[PDB]
Amino acid sequence: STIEEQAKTFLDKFNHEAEDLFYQSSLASWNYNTNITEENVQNMNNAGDKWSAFLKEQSTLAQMYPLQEIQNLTVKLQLQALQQNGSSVLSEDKSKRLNTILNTMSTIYSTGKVCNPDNPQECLLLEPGLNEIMANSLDYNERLWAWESWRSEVGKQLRPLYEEYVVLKNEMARANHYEDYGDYWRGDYEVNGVDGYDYSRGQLIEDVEHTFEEIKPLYEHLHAYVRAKLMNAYPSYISPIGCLPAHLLGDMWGRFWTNLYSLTVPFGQKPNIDVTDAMVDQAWDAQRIFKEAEKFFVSVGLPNMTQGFWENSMLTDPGNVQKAVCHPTAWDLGKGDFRILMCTKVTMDDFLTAHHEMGHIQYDMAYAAQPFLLRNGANEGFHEAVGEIMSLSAATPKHLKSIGLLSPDFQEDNETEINFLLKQALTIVGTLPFTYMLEKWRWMVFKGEIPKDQWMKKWWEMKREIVGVVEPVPHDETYCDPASLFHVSNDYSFIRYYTRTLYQFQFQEALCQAAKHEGPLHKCDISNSTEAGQKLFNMLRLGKSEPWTLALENVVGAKNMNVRPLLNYFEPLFTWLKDQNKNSFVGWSTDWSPYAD
């Protein structure tokens, strides 16, 4: 009948076809991940071609429908999720060039190999060679050499490719009605037509900046403490007021500072919270990890979990004949089909990682009843926060004691709490300033804000301001160090990590408030709290059917982005860092550099 009715019928048919197509593609993907063979790569090619062709056809068929004539909110959301054409908005030649540049850039990043000058045959890739080597070995010269070589043999080659990729990603965004590709990526958070919940793309930037300036004192105190520990370690390599070297942070980009935890441990004599010894003694396994996790979800009110996942999914190493990817992944293959990509050994890090992936699966089939387009998270940060909050809750000593992994005789003293809080800070907020810095730089690059013949320099300059980290040796504009990261080199948004950290903190605080938890936030266990589980599932079942700001307001009560849960979490650690930095200067100075005498 009406154009809206025809659009509804078209969307129904598109959902019916796309569900089967995506299910077949996901089945082929699971087979290829669990079996890396030539025929598996062939069916990746086939499934990718089929999915891309169908997606483009349905994008066009949604495009000829005028989005203005549709009034149903769900139909409007589905159409606008489908009406986007991406790089195809440009000419076919331009889209092909952009795709080829992306493929070349991803290949160069993944195959980035550095060779020692004293041994031409000794060449090592970025992963797992360079990163692990400089994270374990603390040699200043080796870390500096690896950092410079990795950013040289990659950045120099990637700089013209990055300049093409950037403008190309920009021109599609432009034709896609966007000031820059940064705006194109921020359009995911954009909310339109919802009274009291509409969100502008630049509002994400402004909220991220406000949160960063809120955490600025805590970040400065953490930087001061790290600098003091490095003074205790390498006093001659850093100035007491100068910024930290880029190769003395645990990773070349400075994203993760957890590798410096050994150098920055508050109480080294105090043992870390680890029940891996009891994990081995109790003769548990990844299956027992999943069983305890399901019991925990039953305690928080989540329902039982289907045996089809148990049969289809793998929880340990499947030998070597059926070569399988050990990268942590959660798979919502569609139509009640779910899977996990794990190699969980008898450890605690793999325990928490499997918890996170299974929680991602739980979020996935929480909104399974939503249509095919709406069978996803509201934004790119909500999805990870759902796993993060429950992984943190299960990692608390109370849950471990309840499940028997941790002996009841374990005591929670001030020093152990401080060690745990500092480890959590190094893991979480050690990248939040870096996340904001890189996203804003990428934003600047796409919005063309930064100047090319100055880009890298400008980078280093606010590397001295936003991060308080200065490069050990200068890098010319030929260097493309930001593109040396996976997200930039594979066309991935970077603010997702900052947003997901904020969402995980807010959700954890809301769950603790609903569970009436008494004590520090870092000791909060959401176990045996069905009300909090129901409140969480209320948003979880929606997925992206509702505005993400609406979901945040429904869960935590705050529509706007804030780090108040982060402040509550790190307040004891903030006071501890303030006390510890009474002798060490808090902040950084942009003037000093390791290459300046």
Partner 1 sequence: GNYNYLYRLFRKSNLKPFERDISTEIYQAGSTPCNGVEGFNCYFPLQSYG
The catalytic residues are 357, 487
Q: Please state, in angstroms and rounded to a whole number, the distance separating the CA atoms of residues 434 and 466.
A: 8
How far CA 478 is from CA of 126, 156, 344, 568, in Å, comes to 20, 5, 42, 43
Among 10, 261, 331, 505, binds partner 1 (CB under 8 A): 10
Rounded to a whole number of angstroms, the minimum distance from the CB of residue 2 to partner 1 is 11
Amino acid type, 356: H
Q: Report the SS3 class of residue 412.
A: coil
Q: Residue 273 has which token pair?
A: 């919270």
360 labeled binding residue = yes
356 labeled binding residue = yes
547 labeled binding residue = no
Total interface residues for partner 1 by CB under 8 A:
14
Going by C-alpha positions, the residue among 434, 469, 473, 438 that lies closest to residue 594 is 473
Site membership for partner 1, residue 56 (CB under 8 A): no
Site membership for partner 1, residue 2 (CB under 8 A): no
Question: In the structure, how many helices (H) and strands (E) does the chain have?
Answer: 23, 6
Site membership for partner 1, residue 65 (CB under 8 A): yes
Is residue 347 within 8 A of residue 276, CB to CB? The reply is yes
- Which lies closer to partner 1 via its Cβ, residue 2 or residue 119? 2
Cis, bond preceding 128 (omega within 30 deg of 0): yes
- Our measurement of the distance from residue 164's CA atom to the centroid of its chain's CA atoms, rounded to an integer in Å, reads 26
Q: Please state, in angstroms and rounded to a whole number, the distance separating the CA atoms of residues 416 and 569.
A: 15
459 labeled binding residue = yes
- Which lies closer to partner 1 via its Cβ, residue 9 or residue 560? 9
Site membership for partner 1, residue 61 (CB under 8 A): yes
Amino acid type, 317: D
Rounded to a whole number of angstroms, the minimum distance from the CB of residue 16 to partner 1 is 6
Rounded to a whole number of angstroms, the minimum distance from the CB of residue 100 to partner 1 is 32
- Backbone phi and psi for residue 193, each to the nearest 5 degrees, phi listed first: 80, 5
Site membership for partner 1, residue 9 (CB under 8 A): yes
Rounded to a whole number of angstroms, the minimum distance from the CB of residue 17 to partner 1 is 8
Binding region for partner 1 (CB under 8 A) out of 10-18, 29-37, 200-208, 318-326: 10-18
- Which lies closer to partner 1 via its Cβ, residue 6 or residue 137? 6
- Which lies closer to partner 1 via its Cβ, residue 10 or residue 443? 10
- Which lies closer to partner 1 via its Cβ, residue 17 or residue 153? 17
- Spatial neighbors of 490 by CB under 8 A, at least 6 apart, are 102, 105, 106, 109
Is residue 508 within 8 A of residue 524, CB to CB? The reply is yes
**Strand 329-332 relative to strand 338-341, pairing:** antiparallel
Q: Please state, in angstroms and rounded to a whole number, the distance separating the CA atoms of residues 420 and 276.
A: 16
54 by Cβ neighbours in 10 Å (0-12 / 13-18 / 19+) ranks as middle
Rounded to a whole number of angstroms, the minimum distance from the CB of residue 69 to partner 1 is 11
Binding region for partner 1 (CB under 8 A) out of 9-17, 116-124, 146-154, 475-483: 9-17
Binding region for partner 1 (CB under 8 A) out of 2-10, 198-206, 364-372, 392-400: 2-10
- Which lies closer to partner 1 via its Cβ, residue 2 or residue 304? 2
384 labeled binding residue = yes
443 labeled binding residue = no
How far CA 117 is from CA of 121, 241, 349, 594, in Å, comes to 9, 33, 36, 22
Q: Please state, in angstroms and rounded to a whole number, the distance separating the CA atoms of residues 507 and 370.
A: 22
Site membership for partner 1, residue 267 (CB under 8 A): no
Q: What binding mask, one character per residue, do residues 14-53 give for partner 1 by CB under 8 A, x or -?
A: --xx--x--xx-----------------------------
311 labeled binding residue = no
Polymer length of the chain: 597
Q: Please state, in angstroms and rounded to a whole number, the distance separating the CA atoms of residues 543 and 555.
A: 13
- Which lies closer to partner 1 via its Cβ, residue 65 or residue 497? 65
Site membership for partner 1, residue 460 (CB under 8 A): no
Q: Please state, in angstroms and rounded to a whole number, the distance separating the CA atoms of residues 401 and 133.
A: 35
Rounded to a whole number of angstroms, the minimum distance from the CB of residue 97 to partner 1 is 31
Among 36, 48, 52, 64, binds partner 1 (CB under 8 A): 64
Q: Which residues are annotated as a binding site for chloride?
A: 151, 459, 463
Q: Which residues are annotated as a binding site for Zn(2+)?
A: 356, 360, 384
Q: Which residues are annotated as a binding site for substrate?
A: 255, 327-328, 497
**What is the contact surface with partner 1 in residues (CB under 8 A)?**
3, 6-7, 9-10, 13, 16-17, 20, 23-24, 61, 64-65
